[PDB]
Design an enzyme around this catalytic site. Structure first.
Site, PDB file in Angstrom:
ATOM      1  NE  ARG A  55      46.580  10.157  10.981  1.00 29.94           N
ATOM      2  CZ  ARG A  55      47.730  10.695  11.289  1.00 29.94           C
ATOM      3  NH1 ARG A  55      48.876  10.290  10.722  1.00 29.94           N
ATOM      4  NH2 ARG A  55      47.767  11.465  12.361  1.00 29.94           N
ATOM      5  CG  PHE A  60      50.426  16.613   8.495  1.00 32.42           C
ATOM      6  CD1 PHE A  60      51.754  16.927   8.649  1.00 32.42           C
ATOM      7  CD2 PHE A  60      49.947  15.560   9.203  1.00 32.42           C
ATOM      8  CE1 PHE A  60      52.563  16.188   9.533  1.00 32.42           C
ATOM      9  CE2 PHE A  60      50.718  14.833  10.086  1.00 32.42           C
ATOM     10  CZ  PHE A  60      52.036  15.117  10.267  1.00 32.42           C
ATOM     11  CD  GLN A  63      49.442   6.894   8.360  1.00 36.95           C
ATOM     12  OE1 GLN A  63      49.561   8.027   8.802  1.00 36.95           O
ATOM     13  NE2 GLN A  63      49.279   5.814   9.109  1.00 36.95           N
ATOM     14  CG  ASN A 102      57.446   5.143  13.212  1.00 38.08           C
ATOM     15  OD1 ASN A 102      56.840   5.495  14.230  1.00 38.08           O
ATOM     16  ND2 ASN A 102      58.376   5.874  12.583  1.00 38.08           N
ATOM     17  CG  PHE A 113      53.939   9.998   6.247  1.00 37.11           C
ATOM     18  CD1 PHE A 113      54.517   9.153   7.129  1.00 37.11           C
ATOM     19  CD2 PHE A 113      54.388  11.237   6.235  1.00 37.11           C
ATOM     20  CE1 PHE A 113      55.532   9.596   7.891  1.00 37.11           C
ATOM     21  CE2 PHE A 113      55.490  11.633   6.980  1.00 37.11           C
ATOM     22  CZ  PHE A 113      55.976  10.806   7.853  1.00 37.11           C
ATOM     23  CG  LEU A 122      56.863  14.649  10.877  1.00 38.58           C
ATOM     24  CD1 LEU A 122      55.916  14.215   9.781  1.00 38.58           C
ATOM     25  CD2 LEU A 122      56.265  14.142  12.179  1.00 38.58           C
ATOM     26  CG  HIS A 126      57.987   9.551  11.053  1.00 39.87           C
ATOM     27  ND1 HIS A 126      56.960   8.656  11.222  1.00 39.87           N
ATOM     28  CD2 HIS A 126      57.814  10.517  11.985  1.00 39.87           C
ATOM     29  CE1 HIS A 126      56.207   9.051  12.237  1.00 39.87           C
ATOM     30  NE2 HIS A 126      56.692  10.189  12.704  1.00 39.87           N
TER      31      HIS A 126
END
Lengths: 165, 136
Positions: A55, A60, A63, A102, A113, A122, A126
């Site tokens: 991903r 952004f 991942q 997660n 990531f 975030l 995370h």
């Protein structure tokens, strides 16, 4: 050496792209840093060597770490079960931040990531546990293979990995 | 457009519940009255019903069982949520407990849609059937 340094050698559909190194903040998040170190060395008999970034969303983050299912539903820590979010002391301040992917509070496995932007929203969701030391331009190159929903246009793997020193 | 369920529709619902001792008609009546409802509207419809506690608990239990069952067939994907995109709905989110109206419409408007309102409504209808079964 309190804070260990690890590397990924990244390949795109098999061809070497480049090296990314990270400092792991063992001095603030020891348990999270150790998970990631040992998964990078392969010393427990499994971990990141050969896995892929499933991903990638440009602007952004990138991942990875789903070395069991390759899709976001897998992964596994070195503690034999999903582990607690250690703390949220460190923030997601900009490109280069290394944080845990997660599936909800206290669901840490092996996914992670690398931020390619400031992602303040975030913070407290995370666990940040490291940061890119070398090869942010390799990370920026990895972004070119992503898309809006994360699907990649080519296979972005961790061809090799380990600890430095 | 967020158009809440109308007070006209709520008192009609209340009137039905009032007038039946949970008879089979309350079911087509509920689906006829919850057309295009978000989970938020569905709960409003359901919480206006007072004073039938034992039946309401049977209904609650069915939703709760179904929300858990949805969770178990829909394993979450790990990772951070990117601006604009939506999180993957949980059982509690389908039932409106853990989710906002904005998010609910979010999921229902999406293409391809995840019709949380119709999904939750299927679970309510299953509760309601257990109720009419017990009370006839």
């Amino acid at each position: 050496m309190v804070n260990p340094t690890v590397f990924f050698d990244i390949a795109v559909d098999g061809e070497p792209l480049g090296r990314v190194s990270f400092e792991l903040f063992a001095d603030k998040v020891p348990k999270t840093a150790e998970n990631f170190r040992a998964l990078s060395t392969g010393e427990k008999g499994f971990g990141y060597k050969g896995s892929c970034f499933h991903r990638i969303i440009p602007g952004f983050m990138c991942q990875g770490g789903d070395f069991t299912r390759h899709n976001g539903t897998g992964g596994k820590s070195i503690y034999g079960e999903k582990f607690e979010d250690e703390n949220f002391i460190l923030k997601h301040t900009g490109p280069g931040i290394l944080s845990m992917a997660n599936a909800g509070p206290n669901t840490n496995g092996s996914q992670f990531f690398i931020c390619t932007a400031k992602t303040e929203w975030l913070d407290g969701k995370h666990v940040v546990f490291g940061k890119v030391k070398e090869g942010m331009n390799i990370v920026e190159a990895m972004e070119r293979f992503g898309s809006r929903n994360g699907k990649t246009s080519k296979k972005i793997t961790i061809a090799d990995c380990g600890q430095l020193e | 457009v967020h158009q809440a369920i109308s007070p006209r529709t709520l008192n009609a619902w209340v009137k039905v519940v009032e007038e039946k001792a949970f008879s089979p008609e309350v079911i087509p009546m509920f689906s006829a009255l919850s057309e295009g409802a978000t989970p938020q509207d569905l709960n409003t419809m359901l919480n206006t019903v007072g004073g039938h506690q034992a039946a309401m608990q049977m209904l609650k239990e069915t939703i709760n069982e179904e929300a858990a069952e949805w969770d178990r067939l829909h394993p979450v994907h790990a990772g951070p949520i990117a601006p604009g995109q939506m999180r993957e709905p949980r059982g509690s989110d389908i039932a409106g407990t853990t989710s906002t109206l904005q998010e609910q419409i979010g999921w229902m408007t999406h293409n391809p849609p995840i019709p949380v309102g119709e999904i939750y409504k299927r679970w309510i209808i299953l509760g309601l059937n257990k109720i009419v079964r017990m009370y006839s």
